[PDB]
Design a protein around this nucleic acid. Structure first.
Lengths: 269, 93, 95, 265, 253, 262
DNA sequence: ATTTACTACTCGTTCTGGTGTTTCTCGTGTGTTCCCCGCGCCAGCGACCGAGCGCTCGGTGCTGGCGCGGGGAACACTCTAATTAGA
DNA sequence: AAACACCAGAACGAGTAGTAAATTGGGC
């Protein structure tokens, strides 16, 4: 009575689930979230691509084993859902695709081709000619600020500057929204057997490549939608933002379009 | 649109009315494929004929999960809202 | 992707959990989900391979005039009868 | 609690019930066999229930069947229609008066007849032709369709015989089409007896509508079954019929078509 | 004419109808002299019975107890084309329709309608007369009358519903359409409302006012049983068919 | 270095990793001198502990008993760009690949690889030596040997014990490659599979300790050979600290390319 | 004759609380070709108002469904040592 | 410390003869 438990495609999966203030146990082979009161919440871990864990959770060994076998990325998040830690299938990487990504990353010329492909796929227009990675990153920063001012004027949000350290609400919403986009994005890369750390524009960080991929589409749908929530300034923004992101991840079918896009980017090689 | 209704401790009236339109595969488990307004009618029969029992109705939609469900009454398994994603949670004694 | 509904009785907890991996356990033995054809077939493989002595019935949405199609594994007092291709269910008495 | 009927286009075609008594349990159409096995049947989601010989309906059962808008049809051998019961007052006054207005005037009746000829054969009827001439031409084209289909599917054909295998299949197939057809008319609120080409008979109009489309999908398919010559033809026919009534979405296209014909004049 | 069957089974034993009772009392019925068999609750029909009743063109109409309610009827929507086209021809033309309306007025109040009056004016006059009858009965039985949201109005609604029952039974037995009305139009039971409004306050309503005067615990049951007793003893259903044939006969065929 | 934790709950009470036992034994753990934490079955980790390990950059990995099997590790797919690009640069170049293959041969058999030999030639030599070693262990333990015939459907006892043991060694090997910070999919002798490098290192230290033990268990012929093989591998990996010694071996094998690995 | 509201009473299932018992569902020589679900682009549906003597009658863009296409098991191949076992 | 196999006891609901009561869920 032991059959191989195989994971299901990422596009045919729910976006994200948030659990908080309760222990994560495996009951009869199933992902269960027990609360302090004893109420068991069965979770369909197989049909979800990423499970984000909030402070207050106590995950068990068999829980991380189960979430690993069904291809479900576990993401410990902190304030406003920013990713603190992650766990997944360690051997779920493709040798050919890793060697392809790394081959495109080592050489400087192919790396510049990938960066230019990301710029063109983001803004719909080719990058300026004879420009270094730092210059494309500076132009990227200017266009990013122009997008923040343009969205701030479109949706009418009092804007004073981009602030990452929580030390307003708008930024928080963005940090939530983008955070989710980062999260699911990482899962896609893992489902695609690449590495999340081998970036092209961003380097050194353990998820640099992820930041690249998300930065292609974040202002296409996710950031403006986040602005919408800020326009209302709700009492529980995070949750709502989460929901909104989920709906966006449905309406754009993001989980289905990430893997081709990534491949398309590497097709610049 | 596929429609499934599960009933517990309902008077036989609601069970027969559900047998008017749906196929009873198991005791209290009714299966069918109806439109939106007809689903509304079946839910009206449910809320009208259920008085002490607990009923859960789930139908196909175009949402991300694929389906949507609503409950009438009190049961040990109660649906909980997890950031809009409604799941089910099994209460203790 | 279509809608999938699985109803179980007298199944070992292995099968109940396995179904809790992809489906939502609305009722005791009543699980609801929305999966593709491949995932449906896989769930059915786990159902037929893990169920012992118990009875399970699986019903999914299709494009037939009925609007859904179902199949069963095991024995129960309610058995499906074919009336000129149209599949219904009859309730047998004791013995 | 009220109990209103549902659109017929979203129902199942037909069910055949044999050798059992039809009762009502806790408010539900039930078919009990001789062995005691109880078969629940959703009366509301069925457009037409065929009652084969051996069935003993109860009063409550015809009450329920008539309240949900489900036509009951007592049938005989090979599915031929014997009797029927349906909703008595579920007809629209404006529609009945419209159909009767088209039927009383001989010129308007001729216009409706020509509309049936055009929608049947895909070509306008010859000018200045009486109902009887269109009826003879109709019968000739009917025999021509019988010979053409018999040649297409390789069936030994000797003639159209109505008094008691191929013909049987036809009788079954058309029979099925009649059933749902009548039901459709009831769902629209018209009268089955008010016919234009056929008159006098309590289902004349029904036949007319059927005679528009019977040779489109119903007769040829029946020939196919004859091509196999099975041991249990009826069932195979019945099943097959349902499939056609799904594949062509007949219940969805019957009401407009009828209205379309009544648009003549 | 007609016949009411109740509490038994319908079979065919050796060429004729039979009704088996709960005690074992065979009620044989010959295939002739019955144009419409009426089945009350408590009746189960075998297949051969419907086959024989269909061969000889016998109308089967599933109705309540003593025809108090009409539930179903064989040959849906009418069995005779001539009668349907006749009622329809009378109702389509405004002059023949006016003649049938004036005949209903005459048989209703006992006096000919005023000349050069349209259907609308006759409807207003008939309405005012209905008010006068309501106040008159309310004074005769001592019932507080004020003029329903979807006990006196309850009894009135119940009685009028039963009468709509027997009236629809008569219209179906005769072979005509219940939806084709003359005073009422558009409704699926317009003709039922006309023929029933002809004899409504003749007998049935005063009994509902009496029950309303007694004020019982279950008014609906007492009103329905009273209506079944009036329809049974007075043979109102047997007397209805000639009335309808006369009303439609006033259109000069 | 590295630390194993088992049968207790991980938390942070006064700013340090604590492991709680069923008997109430607190095991504080300083954030220093721990490059990776090994989580054995029976361990429930809190959120504060994961946050603290995440801030310092301590890699966490969920493994079995003595790392017999590996299930999930933090920062999936790799956390270090330098080591990933390093192993990739070694695997892409055919010359560097030949260097690493030769180093694997020398560390495997204790003698340098023959000169002017390609990768495939060393694979063939390695294969003949592997067959000869199977026959040699068969003679030393007295087991009737007919060949490695594995059917991934039905699941012979000797191939069973060998299979389980190789699975355990794949476990500790993948755990070691993770603790070192490299990719288990990027291999040199083996290619394409998602655990090629794991198969390389495992092939280096295969016949040293685990397989002779597998032949001992097959010699005893127990009722449950899988359990005894996994537990014996747990004992060998524990008392021999094979996982601790595997990291210097891996960093040396990859160091054979001479590009200065960081 | 049929059906349902109401009532003990049997029968079966689920659920839970005790013991034990285990930390378990794994084997991997590396790379090229025919077959079919999946997205993908273009056609069909989901209150004021007249007649008499306030009252009375009440009438008048997704979506599923046919199509190109891009991702999996035979076998197609080094290389060595006593023509097949091993990588 | 977490999780599953196995078995006995408690709680709970469906199915089923029995009794009794009705022939019923409006109106226009």
């Amino acid at each position: 009575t032991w059959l191989p438990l195989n994971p299901i495609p990422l596009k045919d999966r729910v976006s994200m689930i948030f659990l908080q203030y309760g222990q994560i146990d495996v009951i009869d082979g199933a992902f269960v979230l027990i609360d302090k009161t004893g109420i068991r919440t069965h979770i369909p871990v197989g049909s979800v691509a990423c499970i984000m864990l909030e402070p207050g959770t106590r995950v068990s060994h068999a829980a991380v084993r189960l979430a690993a076998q069904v291809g479900t990325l576990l993401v410990w998040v902190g304030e406003a859902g920013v990713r603190v830690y992650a766990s997944g299938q360690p051997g779920g990487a493709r040798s050919d695709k890793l060697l392809y990504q790394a081959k495109l990353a080592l050489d400087e010329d192919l790396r510049l081709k990938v960066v230019r492909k990301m710029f063109e796929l983001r803004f719909g227009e080719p990058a300026p000619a004879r420009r270094s990675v730092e210059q494309l990153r500076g132009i990227e920063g200017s266009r990013v600020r122009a997008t923040y001012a343009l969205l701030a004027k479109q949706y009418g949000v009092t804007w004073n500057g981009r602030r990452y350290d929580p030390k307003d609400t708008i930024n928080q919403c963005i940090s939530a929204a983008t955070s989710c986009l980062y999260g699911v994005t990482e899962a896609a890369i893992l489902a695609a057997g690449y590495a999340p750390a081998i970036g092209f524009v961003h380097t050194g960080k353990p998820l640099s490549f992820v930041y690249d991929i998300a930065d292609i589409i974040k202002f296409d749908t996710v950031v403006p939608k986040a602005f919408e929530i800020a326009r209302r300034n709700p009492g529980e923004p995070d949750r709502e933002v989460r929901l909104a992101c989920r709906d966006i991840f449905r309406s754009s079918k993001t989980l289905a379009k990430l893997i081709p896009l990534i491949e398309d980017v590497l097709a610049a090689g | 649109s596929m429609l499934v209704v599960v009933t517990e401790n309902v008077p036989p009236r609601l069970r027969g009315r559900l047998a008017i339109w749906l196929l009873e595969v198991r005791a209290g488990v009714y299966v069918g494929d109806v439109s939106a307004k007809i689903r509304e009618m079946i839910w009206e029969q449910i809320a009208g004929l259920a008085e002490e029992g607990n009923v859960v109705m789930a139908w196909a939609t175009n949402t991300e999960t694929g389906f949507e469900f609503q409950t009438f009454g009190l049961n040990r398994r109660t649906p909980v809202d997890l950031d809009g994603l409604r799941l089910v949670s099994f209460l203790p004694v």
